[PDB]
C-alpha cells in the first residue's frame, strides 16, 4: 500500500503527486504509524474536506483512531483554537498577533538587517536557516508574545522535537512541553510582562469576565502560538528563499521592483512544500468525497501541494506568476474552521525578510549544489538542516 509521506525534499514536488491527482485524487495510503488513511490531492476535494466540519481536527486525537503520527501535545490541546474560542479569547488573540502592531514591522526590519549585517561581517558562506530565517522568526515571536528576547533561543530548541512527525510517542516532547508550559505560567505571574500576547493574556487572567478560564489554557496559548508561529515562519521563509535562489530572474525582478514582493511571497506561499504531511481530519459521518465513500472514523489527509499545484485551479502550477487572477486562493494557510490565525503575521515576516535580504545580498546564491541540502526527516515541516549561501 502506498506509503506517505512521499519525499522529505522541499525543493521539488514528486512527479507522483500530479499522476495521483489526475487518476486517484482521493487514494488510500498507509501512514508512518501503520494506519490507513485517505490522501486527498486535488484542489476541489481538498477544499471540500477542509470546508466540511464533519471532517474533524478535534477527533483525530480520540483514543483508538487511525493516526497520521503520534501526538506531541496533550489530546485536549489538539482542539486549542476551539478552546480559545469557547473561552471568549479569539478577538484578543487575533489583535495581539497582527503584524500592524505599532513598531512591530520596524522591529522586523531592524532585526533582519542586523542579522544580515552580522553574516556579511563574518563572510560567506552563511547559513540562511540557522543564522537568519529561524532567528528572525524567534525574535518576531518573542516580541509578539511580549517575552524577553533572551528567552527565545531556549524556547526555540524545543521545536526540533515538538514538531516531529513520529510513529510513536516522544519522551523528550513531554519533557519540553511541561517545561515550556511552566515557563509561560511564570510569564503570566510576572508583573513586568505587560505587552504582546502574554501581556494581554495576563490582564484577562485577572479580569472577572474571564475568571473561569483556566491558568492551563492561558499558558497553552503562549506555548502553542510561539511554537506554531516560529516553526511555520522560520520554515516557510527558509524554503521560500530556496525557491527564490533557484529563480535568479525572479530574484532580480523583486530586487529591482520590491513593490512586487508581496505578490512574489503570495506565489512563494502557493508553491511552498513546507508542510511535510497532509492536514489530518477524522470523519464523523459517512461522506462522499469524489469516487470514495469515506466512512465514519476514517482518517483523511489533505495534501496542500496537491491543491496548490492543481493545474485546473492554477494553470502552469510550477511557474511563479505575479499576476494570477486567483492569487490568495491557495491553501498554504489551510481553509475553513482551522484557517491559520497567524496568516497576516506569516506573510509580513516573509515579505520583510525577503525585502531585507535582497537589499543586503542582491547576488545571493547557493554555496553548495542544491542536492547537497540535507532534508530533515520525520518532521512536520520540510526544511534543510543548513542553507549555505554566498553573495
Ligand atoms: C508562513 C507561515 C505559516 C504557515 C504556512 C502556516 C500554516 C498553517 C496551516 C496550513 C494551518 C491549518 C492546519 C490545519 O487546518 O490542520 C495553520 C494553523 C495554525 N497556525 Fe499557522 N501558519 C503560519 C504562520 C503562523 C503563525 C505566525 C502563527 C501564530 C503566531 C500560527 C499559528 C497557527 C495555529 C495556532 C494554528 C491552528 C489553528 C486551528 O487549530 O484552528 N501560524 N497554519
Ligand atoms: F491548536 C493547536 F494547539 F495549535 C493545535 C492544533 C492541532 C494539533 C494537532 C496535532 C496532531 C494532529 C494529528 N494527530 C496525530 C495523532 N493524533 C492526532 C492533529 C492536530 C495540535 C495543536
Ligand atoms: F514543545 C512546545 F514548544 F511546547 C510546543 C509543542 C507543540 C506545539 C504545537 C502547536 C501546534 C501544532 C499544530 N499545528 C501545526 C501547525 N499549525 C498547527 C502542533 C504542535 C507548540 C509548541
Swiss-Prot record:
Substrate binds at residues 72, 80-81, 232, 296, 380. Transmembrane segments: none annotated. One of its GO terms (cellular component) is cytoplasm. Catalyzes C-C bond formation between the carbons ortho to the phenolic hydroxyl of cyclo(L-tyr-L-tyr) (cYY) producing mycocyclosin. Can also use cyclo(L-Tyr-L-Phe) (cYF), cyclo(L-Tyr-L-Trp) (cYW) and cyclo(L-Tyr-L-3,4-dihydroxyphenylalanine) (cY-DOPA) as substrate. Its main location: cytoplasm. The lineage of its organism: Bacteria, Bacillati, Actinomycetota, Actinomycetes, Mycobacteriales. It is found in: Cytoplasm. Its cofactor is heme. The record marks 163, 177 as: Participates in a stacking interactions with the tyrosyl of cYY. Coiled coil: none annotated. GO terms for molecular function: heme binding; iron ion binding; monooxygenase activity; oxidoreductase activity, acting on paired donors, with incorporation or reduction of molecular oxygen. Its EC number is 1.14.19.70. It catalyses: cyclo(L-tyrosyl-L-tyrosyl) + 2 reduced [2Fe-2S]-[ferredoxin] + O2 + 2 H(+) = mycoclysin + 2 oxidized [2Fe-2S]-[ferredoxin] + 2 H2O. Heme binds at residues 281, 338, 340. Keywords: Cytoplasm, Heme, Iron, Metal-binding, Monooxygenase, Oxidoreductase. Belongs to the cytochrome P450 family. PANTHER family: CYTOCHROME P450 YJIB-RELATED, P450, PUTATIVE (EUROFUNG)-RELATED. This is Mycocyclosin synthase. The record marks 341 as: Important for the position of heme. InterPro entries: Cyt_P450, Cyt_P450_B, Cyt_P450_CS, Cyt_P450_sf.
Amino acid at each position: 500500500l502506498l506509503e506517505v509521506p512521499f519525499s522529505a525534499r522541499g525543493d521539488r514536488i514528486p512527479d507522483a503527486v500530479a499522476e495521483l491527482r489526475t487518476r486517484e485524487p482521493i487514494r488510500k495510503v498507509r501512514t508512518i504509524t501503520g494506519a490507513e488513511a485517505w490522501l486527498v490531492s486535488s484542489y476541489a476535494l481538498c477544499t471540500q474536506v477542509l470546508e466540511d466540519r464533519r471532517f474533524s481536527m478535534k477527533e483525530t486525537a480520540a483514543a483508538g483512531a487511525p493516526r497520521l503520527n503520534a501526538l506531541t501535545v496533550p489530546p485536549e490541546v489538539v482542539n486549542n483554537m476551539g478552546n480559545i474560542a469557547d473561552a471568549g479569547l479569539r478577538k484578543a488573540v487575533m489583535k495581539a498577533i497582527t503584524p500592524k502592531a505599532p513598531g512591530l514591522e520596524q522591529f522586523l526590519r531592524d532585526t533582519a538587517n542586523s542579522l544580515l549585517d552580522n553574516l556579511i561581517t563574518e563572510g560567506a558562506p552563511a547559513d540562511l536557516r540557522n543564522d537568519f530565517a529561524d532567528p528572525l522568526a524567534t525574535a518576531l515571536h518573542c516580541k509578539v508574545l511580549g517575552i524577553p528576547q533572551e528567552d527565545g533561543p531556549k524556547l526555540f530548541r524545543s521545536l526540533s522535537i515538538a514538531f516531529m512527525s513520529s510513529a510513536d510517542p516522544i519522551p523528550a516532547a513531554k519533557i519540553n512541553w511541561d517545561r515550556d508550559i511552566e515557563y509561560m505560567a511564570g510569564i503570566l505571574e510576572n508583573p513586568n510582562i505587560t505587552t504582546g500576547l502574554m501581556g494581554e493574556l495576563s490582564r484577562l487572567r485577572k479580569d472577572p469576565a474571564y475568571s473561569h478560564v483556566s491558568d492551563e489554557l492561558f499558558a497553552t496559548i503562549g506555548v502553542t502560538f510561539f511554537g506554531a508561529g516560529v516553526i511555520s515562519t522560520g520554515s516557510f521563509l527558509t524554503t521560500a528563499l530556496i525557491s527564490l535562489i533557484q529563480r535568479p530572474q525572479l530574484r532580480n525582478l523583486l530586487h529591482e521592483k520590491p513593490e512586487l514582493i508581496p505578490a512574489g511571497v503570495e506565489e512563494l506561499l502557493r508553491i511552498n512544500l513546507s508542510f511535510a504531511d497532509g492536514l489530518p481530519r477524522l470523519a464523523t459521518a459517512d461522506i462522499q468525497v469524489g469516487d470514495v465513500l469515506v466512512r465514519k472514523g476514517e482518517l483523511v489527509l489533505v495534501l496542500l501541494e496537491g491543491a496548490n499545484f492543481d493545474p485546473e485551479h492554477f494553470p502552469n502550477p510550477g511557474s511563479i506568476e505575479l499576476d494570477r487572477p486567483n492569487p490568495t486562493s491557495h491553501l498554504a494557510f489551510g481553509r475553513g474552521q482551522h484557517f491559520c490565525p497567524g496568516s497576516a503575521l506569516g506573510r509580513r515576516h516573509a515579505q520583510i525578510g525577503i525585502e531585507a535580504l535582497l537589499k543586503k545580498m542582491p547576488g545571493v546564491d547557493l554555496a553548495v549544489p542544491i542536492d547537497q541540502l540535507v532534508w530533515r526527516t520525520r518532521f512536520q515541516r520540510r526544511i534543510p538542516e543548513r542553507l549555505p549561501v554566498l553573495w
